[PDB]
Motif scaffolding. Structure first.
Motif, PDB file in Angstrom:
ATOM      1  N   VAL A   1      24.890 -19.744  -2.630  1.00 54.42           N
ATOM      2  CA  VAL A   1      24.455 -20.804  -2.505  1.00 54.42           C
ATOM      3  C   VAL A   1      25.276 -22.157  -1.948  1.00 54.42           C
ATOM      4  O   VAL A   1      26.419 -21.987  -2.514  1.00 54.42           O
ATOM      5  CB  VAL A   1      23.802 -21.358  -3.966  1.00 54.42           C
ATOM      6  CG1 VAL A   1      22.532 -20.179  -4.474  1.00 54.42           C
ATOM      7  CG2 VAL A   1      24.828 -21.520  -4.889  1.00 54.42           C
ATOM      8  N   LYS A   2      24.802 -22.662  -1.135  1.00 56.07           N
ATOM      9  CA  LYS A   2      25.453 -23.897  -0.340  1.00 56.07           C
ATOM     10  C   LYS A   2      25.048 -25.163  -0.775  1.00 56.07           C
ATOM     11  O   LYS A   2      23.804 -25.315  -1.007  1.00 56.07           O
ATOM     12  CB  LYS A   2      25.596 -23.615   1.021  1.00 56.07           C
ATOM     13  CG  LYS A   2      25.962 -24.498   1.881  1.00 56.07           C
ATOM     14  CD  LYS A   2      26.445 -24.123   3.296  1.00 56.07           C
ATOM     15  CE  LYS A   2      26.832 -25.144   4.190  1.00 56.07           C
ATOM     16  NZ  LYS A   2      26.910 -24.649   5.615  1.00 56.07           N
TER      17      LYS A   2
ATOM     18  N   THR B   1      28.922 -18.336  -5.712  1.00 56.70           N
ATOM     19  CA  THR B   1      28.561 -16.927  -5.355  1.00 56.70           C
ATOM     20  C   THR B   1      28.152 -16.469  -6.560  1.00 56.70           C
ATOM     21  O   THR B   1      28.535 -16.645  -7.843  1.00 56.70           O
ATOM     22  CB  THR B   1      29.767 -16.053  -4.995  1.00 56.70           C
ATOM     23  OG1 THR B   1      30.666 -16.560  -4.011  1.00 56.70           O
ATOM     24  CG2 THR B   1      29.318 -14.650  -4.878  1.00 56.70           C
ATOM     25  N   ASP B   2      26.515 -16.048  -6.487  1.00 59.04           N
ATOM     26  CA  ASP B   2      26.188 -15.790  -7.802  1.00 59.04           C
ATOM     27  C   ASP B   2      25.894 -14.275  -8.122  1.00 59.04           C
ATOM     28  O   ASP B   2      25.510 -13.516  -7.126  1.00 59.04           O
ATOM     29  CB  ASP B   2      24.417 -16.358  -7.714  1.00 59.04           C
ATOM     30  CG  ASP B   2      23.655 -16.155  -9.164  1.00 59.04           C
ATOM     31  OD1 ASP B   2      23.487 -15.084  -9.399  1.00 59.04           O
ATOM     32  OD2 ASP B   2      23.476 -17.170  -9.728  1.00 59.04           O
ATOM     33  N   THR B   3      26.523 -13.959  -9.460  1.00 56.76           N
ATOM     34  CA  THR B   3      26.421 -12.325  -9.743  1.00 56.76           C
ATOM     35  C   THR B   3      25.382 -12.520 -11.139  1.00 56.76           C
ATOM     36  O   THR B   3      24.840 -11.346 -11.347  1.00 56.76           O
ATOM     37  CB  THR B   3      27.979 -11.961 -10.103  1.00 56.76           C
ATOM     38  OG1 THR B   3      28.777 -12.722 -10.808  1.00 56.76           O
ATOM     39  CG2 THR B   3      28.451 -11.726  -8.922  1.00 56.76           C
TER      40      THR B   3
ATOM     41  N   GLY C   1      29.235 -16.908 -13.724  1.00 54.66           N
ATOM     42  CA  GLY C   1      28.915 -16.003 -12.516  1.00 54.66           C
ATOM     43  C   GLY C   1      27.389 -16.629 -12.041  1.00 54.66           C
ATOM     44  O   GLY C   1      27.073 -16.187 -11.039  1.00 54.66           O
ATOM     45  N   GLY C   2      26.907 -17.741 -12.414  1.00 56.62           N
ATOM     46  CA  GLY C   2      26.027 -18.329 -11.928  1.00 56.62           C
ATOM     47  C   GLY C   2      25.162 -19.179 -13.006  1.00 56.62           C
ATOM     48  O   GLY C   2      25.636 -19.443 -14.130  1.00 56.62           O
ATOM     49  N   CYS C   3      24.024 -19.843 -12.498  1.00 54.66           N
ATOM     50  CA  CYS C   3      23.454 -20.711 -13.176  1.00 54.66           C
ATOM     51  C   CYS C   3      21.871 -20.730 -12.571  1.00 54.66           C
ATOM     52  O   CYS C   3      21.643 -21.284 -11.485  1.00 54.66           O
ATOM     53  CB  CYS C   3      23.817 -22.194 -13.048  1.00 54.66           C
ATOM     54  SG  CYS C   3      22.953 -23.507 -13.945  1.00 54.66           S
ATOM     55  N   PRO C   4      20.609 -20.170 -13.326  1.00 54.42           N
ATOM     56  CA  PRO C   4      19.505 -20.044 -12.952  1.00 54.42           C
ATOM     57  C   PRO C   4      18.823 -21.533 -12.949  1.00 54.42           C
ATOM     58  O   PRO C   4      19.078 -22.264 -13.980  1.00 54.42           O
ATOM     59  CB  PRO C   4      18.787 -19.261 -13.939  1.00 54.42           C
ATOM     60  CG  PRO C   4      19.438 -19.390 -15.207  1.00 54.42           C
ATOM     61  CD  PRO C   4      21.220 -19.314 -14.684  1.00 54.42           C
ATOM     62  N   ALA C   5      18.460 -22.086 -11.830  1.00 55.86           N
ATOM     63  CA  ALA C   5      18.030 -23.487 -11.630  1.00 55.86           C
ATOM     64  C   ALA C   5      16.689 -23.639 -10.642  1.00 55.86           C
ATOM     65  O   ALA C   5      16.867 -22.878  -9.488  1.00 55.86           O
ATOM     66  CB  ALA C   5      19.053 -24.384 -11.346  1.00 55.86           C
TER      67      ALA C   5
ATOM     68  N   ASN D   1      16.616 -19.293  -8.558  1.00 56.76           N
ATOM     69  CA  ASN D   1      15.945 -19.115  -9.814  1.00 56.76           C
ATOM     70  C   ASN D   1      15.630 -17.926 -10.334  1.00 56.76           C
ATOM     71  O   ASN D   1      15.368 -17.064  -9.656  1.00 56.76           O
ATOM     72  CB  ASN D   1      14.669 -20.221  -9.733  1.00 56.76           C
ATOM     73  CG  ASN D   1      14.007 -20.375 -10.984  1.00 56.76           C
ATOM     74  OD1 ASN D   1      14.656 -20.074 -12.003  1.00 56.76           O
ATOM     75  ND2 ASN D   1      12.623 -20.495 -11.071  1.00 56.76           N
ATOM     76  N   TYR D   2      15.997 -17.605 -11.553  1.00 55.90           N
ATOM     77  CA  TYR D   2      15.767 -16.176 -12.104  1.00 55.90           C
ATOM     78  C   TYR D   2      15.591 -16.440 -13.409  1.00 55.90           C
ATOM     79  O   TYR D   2      16.181 -17.437 -14.456  1.00 55.90           O
ATOM     80  CB  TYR D   2      16.899 -15.446 -11.814  1.00 55.90           C
ATOM     81  CG  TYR D   2      18.381 -15.776 -12.013  1.00 55.90           C
ATOM     82  CD1 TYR D   2      18.970 -16.302 -10.815  1.00 55.90           C
ATOM     83  CD2 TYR D   2      19.132 -15.612 -13.054  1.00 55.90           C
ATOM     84  CE1 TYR D   2      20.204 -16.799 -10.721  1.00 55.90           C
ATOM     85  CE2 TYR D   2      20.591 -16.066 -13.145  1.00 55.90           C
ATOM     86  CZ  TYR D   2      20.964 -16.881 -12.121  1.00 55.90           C
ATOM     87  OH  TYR D   2      22.178 -17.184 -12.034  1.00 55.90           O
ATOM     88  N   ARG D   3      15.246 -15.497 -14.376  1.00 54.92           N
ATOM     89  CA  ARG D   3      14.902 -15.650 -15.773  1.00 54.92           C
ATOM     90  C   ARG D   3      15.805 -14.897 -16.700  1.00 54.92           C
ATOM     91  O   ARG D   3      15.726 -13.504 -16.471  1.00 54.92           O
ATOM     92  CB  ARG D   3      13.497 -15.268 -16.128  1.00 54.92           C
ATOM     93  CG  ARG D   3      12.867 -15.491 -17.476  1.00 54.92           C
ATOM     94  CD  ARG D   3      12.405 -16.813 -17.705  1.00 54.92           C
ATOM     95  NE  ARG D   3      11.026 -17.091 -16.842  1.00 54.92           N
ATOM     96  CZ  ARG D   3      10.287 -16.566 -16.762  1.00 54.92           C
ATOM     97  NH1 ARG D   3       9.895 -15.184 -17.577  1.00 54.92           N
ATOM     98  NH2 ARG D   3       9.096 -16.965 -15.875  1.00 54.92           N
TER      99      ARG D   3
END
Ligand code: HEM
Ligand code: HEM
Ligand SMILES: CNCc1cc(OCc2ccc3ccc(N)nc3c2)ccc1Cl
Ligand SMILES: CNCc1cc(OCc2ccc3ccc(N)nc3c2)ccc1Cl
Ligand SMILES: CNCc1cc(OCc2ccc3ccc(N)nc3c2)ccc1Cl
Ligand SMILES: C[C@H](O)[C@H](O)[C@H]1CNc2nc(N)[nH]c(=O)c2N1
Ligand SMILES: C[C@H](O)[C@H](O)[C@H]1CNc2nc(N)[nH]c(=O)c2N1
Ligand SMILES: [Zn+2]
Lengths: 413, 408
Positions: free
Chosen positions: B5-6, B15-17, B362-366, B389-391
């Protein structure tokens, strides 16, 4: 995929039903487990790839003119097939080209201006062979579309891609944009968005005036050749000095903008055919200039200067000085365009029209793909009707697509 | 795969894992994005959900695969076998409640996620007990204006016929009344809930800002009415630092935003009554509550007092009035030393939170659609931030209003 997907407007309780999504062509980037709705961007067709893409388009066209299954339909299919068979490509009829261009616009999920989609002047420039010829077509486009301030939507379409080594491209991102110049001290003069392109123009021979609002030259590539520089006749470039109805000092900021937004770096896809140079233009929504162009940190970034002139308390963010200045700037933009009789639409009027357009589309077409992230304006979101409108996003063809910047791919001769 | 994501303003790329861990659905498919749609057990289902949660708990305290970890799994398994459910440890309840907040894609305030006071109310049996727990929550969270985030968790769902529910959508809300002339007095969002209170015997003062009674359901029984002690309800008169007439509008609002209608899910268990509270971002009140056409709808009155030209939309009279109203709200809470955050400061904190989460998690759902403030969007840093976005679970979920399910 369910036959019926429902969207709700949470302000009006109006529920609409979408069936058009069943015609979705390509993937969005989302999956069952992830949504990429806020991601900005989430070698030619072979014969076998091209056949069904062409048929899908021809079918759609003949269905639109109520001649589906007609002898003309079947004859067109056969002719297109033979042409792909013997030349690995085909040529659109003028009627098909026009239909295709209008529908790429009708299908542009990110466009709030689509109530106007069927009123698009299409210039067929497929006979063009040289950059000078491209220049001629573009000047005529700018002149027609500008229309002394009474702007008219238009698209000029150059020859489609063949082997990928003979592309026509407009190197400019828009036909009219202002230069940006990086200074040795790290500051930027003019529009920071355009620094890279400006640097390319200078290298190609452009002598820059080095001002704050220098109209960039056209950098035009024909038939895969090296691009060539041209200066747009200044009398063809309509501009509006920005002033404010209450603040007499606003004019002393020296701001102006151009009247014609003319995006030129997108690719038009029709029936598998790829038109890599297809500059198109409409008219502005005020926030594009007043919020983004003027107030983005990475652009002209005028908020502080305006706030200072307004004598706001800029010590705490909670004074909302930025928000206050932002509105006054947008007021100034709309007021200046209207005063000079140059077509422009405010974000309330535009989003209200779009809601009506969307409802009409759902009812006559079975849906209207829309990208909420882009449709909702960059200021005052929730006091526009689109904020409360559920949308469905999906990709229909014909379509406008992104393509890599040509300087990153071009083989210099 | 690893997803990038930029931020288009700072050019920072993350970088999302973490998304690789999600197992719940978003609502989108490969062909259709539903990002702007608002709302898109058994022993056999229960254990793997329980195990998934116990595993992440034990991983979080760096005792994954320990004797204690293994013992807990067996303990939970037996418990599900013999009772068809299980009970969380206090430590797990707290861990799960904080992570539900941490995973709430739509919440811009998550930088605070680990500072959450958790009130265990699983021993509650009656509506009177719920009232007591709720009063204690409100008193603690309000803290004379120095607001503290909290959650009170009532017994989990069993057979679905004995649900604990707070019928109010928030602990503190203003009534709304239909008027003979078809207009609406007070908050139109709460007209239906107000009618139910009235039918159940609440005597309405019929004002513009009447604090609603609590309507509380315990163990699937009919809900009961309670009046929150007025000294527990902190309110702020809205005035403007420049416009002296603004107070004459007679606007006020409550200090404590306490959402009470969501469902908390932890390890397959469902907590249908879990009122939680933080503090306000100014626009929640000044933009949505006051200026939504379907809410208090005050733009017109304010623009009048500002003597704006309300004849054409392009004068941006709505936009001008909207800013002044949000200035007033922030100024009012601040002057009364009631915690509040402006949308600039809040979105800034969220960007920093995101950086933190990418680094440590490693990430943040938003959910960009919700994270971006309802005014001045692109002059906040979140507008230019790509989000995924992920749950993830534990999570907070929507649930149906109890008056659409309840048999009396
Ligand atoms: C007639 C007046 C029009 C208005 C008021 C309008 C409005 C807008 C606005 C405000 C945006 C978002 C711009 C941004 O934030 O970058 C947009 C995007 C877009 N517009 Fe329209 N537009 C108009 C005409 C057209 C025409 C004539 C076409 C094509 C024939 C078109 C195609 C598109 C496409 C493809 C996008 C998305 C571009 C992208 O993804 O980067 N629009 N429009
Ligand atoms: C501490 C200060 C906090 C701030 C400033 C804050 C800010 C916000 C805002 C502005 C929204 C959008 C609300 C709307 O537009 O209706 C939101 C949503 C949300 N918040 Fe937070 N919040 C805070 C604390 C909390 C806490 C303590 C929790 C739970 C323990 C929480 C969970 C959520 C959830 C689940 C949503 C989404 C609600 C939905 O999906 O409808 N927040 N937050
Ligand atoms: C530069 N921002 C991304 C981007 C936006 C683009 O289009 C913005 C756009 C496109 C068409 C428009 C038509 C009318 C109008 N008023 N604005 C319009 C704005 C095209 C390419 C790219 Cl890469
Ligand atoms: C209701 N319990 C039955 C059941 C037990 C299951 O596993 C029980 C169990 C007990 C102890 C475990 C210890 C470690 C581990 N990895 N799995 C463990 C699993 C799985 C599915 C079902 Cl349906
Ligand atoms: C009513 N709008 C949708 C909706 C929002 C909900 O919660 C919004 C919400 C939730 C938690 C919050 C915590 C703090 C805060 N300042 N606002 C907060 C706002 C709950 C249910 C629904 Cl249906
Ligand atoms: C249709 C759309 O999803 C809906 O109006 C959303 C938009 N974004 C929002 N964002 C926040 N924070 N809160 C909301 O209630 C909404 N409403
Ligand atoms: C990260 C995010 O997708 C990006 O900033 C988008 C947000 N919405 C937008 N909406 C419009 N109309 N134009 C834009 O450039 C953007 N930028
Ligand atoms: Zn999606």
């Amino acid at each position: 995929c369910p036959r019926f997907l429902k969207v709700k407007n949470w302000e009006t309780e109006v529920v609409l039903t979408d069936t058009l999504h069943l015609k979705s062509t390509l993937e969005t980037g989302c999956t069952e487990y992830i949504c990429m709705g806020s991601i900005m961007h989430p070698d030619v067709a072979t014969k076998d790839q091209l056949f069904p893409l062409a048929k899908e388009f021809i079918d759609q066209y003949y269905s639109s003119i109520k001649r589906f299954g007609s002898k003309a339909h079947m004859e067109r299919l056969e002719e297109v097939n033979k042409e792909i068979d013997t030349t690995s490509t085909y040529q659109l009829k003028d009627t098909e080209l026009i239909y295709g261009a209008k529908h790429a616009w009708r299908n542009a999920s990110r466009c709030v201006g689509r109530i106007q989609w069927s009123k698009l002047q299409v210039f067929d420039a497929r006979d063009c062979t040289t950059a000078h010829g491209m220049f001629n077509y573009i000047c005529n486009h700018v002149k027609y579309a500008t229309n002394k301030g009474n702007l008219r939507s238009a698209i000029t379409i150059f020859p489609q891609r063949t082997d990928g080594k003979h592309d026509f491209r407009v190197w400019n991102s828009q036909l009219i944009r202002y230069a940006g110049y990086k200074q040795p001290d790290g500051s930027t003069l003019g529009d920071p968005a355009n620094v890279q392109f400006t640097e390319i123009c200078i290298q190609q021979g452009w002598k820059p005036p080095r001002g704050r609002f220098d109209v960039l030259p056209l950098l035009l590539q024909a038939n895969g050749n090296d691009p060539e520089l041209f200066q747009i006749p200044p009398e063809l470039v309509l501009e509006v000095p920005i002033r404010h109805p209450k603040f007499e000092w606003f004019k002393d900021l020296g701001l102006k903008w151009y009247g014609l937004p003319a995006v030129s770096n997108m690719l038009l896809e029709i029936g598998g055919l790829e038109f890599s140079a297809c500059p198109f233009s409409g008219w502005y929504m005020g926030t594009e200039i007043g919020v983004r162009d003027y107030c983005d940190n990475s652009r002209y970034n005028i908020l502080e200067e305006v706030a200072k002139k307004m004598n706001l308390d800029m010590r705490k963010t909670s004074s909302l000085w930025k928000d206050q200045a932002l509105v006054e700037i947008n007021i100034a933009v709309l007021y200046s365009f209207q005063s000079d009789k140059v077509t422009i639409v405010d974000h309330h009027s535009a989003t209200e029209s779009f809601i009506k357009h969307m409802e009409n589309e759902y009812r006559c077409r079975g849906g209207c793909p829309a990208d909420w992230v882009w449709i909702v304006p960059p200021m005052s979101g929730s006091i526009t009707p689109v904020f409360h409108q559920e949308m469905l996003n999906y990709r229909l063809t014909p379509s406008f697509e992104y393509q890599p910047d040509p300087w990153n791919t071009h083989v210099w001769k």
